[PDB]
Amino acid sequence: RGRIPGRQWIGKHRRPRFVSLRAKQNMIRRLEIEAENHYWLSMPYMTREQERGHAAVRRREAFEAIKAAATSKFPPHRFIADQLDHLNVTKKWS
């Protein structure tokens, strides 16, 4: 006895769910953290006009580094030493 029709948690007739004091406290804690986040986000240091262009040089140099890395992609070097070292497989004693 005590059947939930169909599947629990999905249908029209779902298993009842009840919030515990633990869950309420957890949600309240998260809400307090977010309220503090609002407070600390409500006090910007610079204005938009003051910040305009203050990181342009660094951002451009970072993208220049990215572009250089992208455009420096080229096959690796090949050396005669690497090819000739394979002869050592038949290196023996005397």
Binding site: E34, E36, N37, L41, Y45, T47
Partner: protein, 120 residues
Amino acid sequence: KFTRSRIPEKVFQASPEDHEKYGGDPQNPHKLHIVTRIKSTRRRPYWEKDIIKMLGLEKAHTPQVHKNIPSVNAKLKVVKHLIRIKPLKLPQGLPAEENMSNTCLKSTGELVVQWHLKPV
């Protein structure tokens, strides 16, 4: 339809009671935020996922320093429910080249520039 949420601007206008509670003077605002991801981007929209990646908060409980400027603040407002924001405090001032290797970010949010690991 579920869409991106536009936070009303009045939310981010602190009150004197808020100033007294959280210990921050409206004048002389702090320069840098310490931001830590305390929530998973899973089960959250892809735009929040992308904002978290942009802010470099992929790892949870890993503090990141960010500028307290309007654009960074806009991003932090977008992802404000997944992060904890605190003001970075510099009791001994900004670290110098000499002491750059002895810094430490205490849980209080203070970047102490001398870390001796010895009793006071």
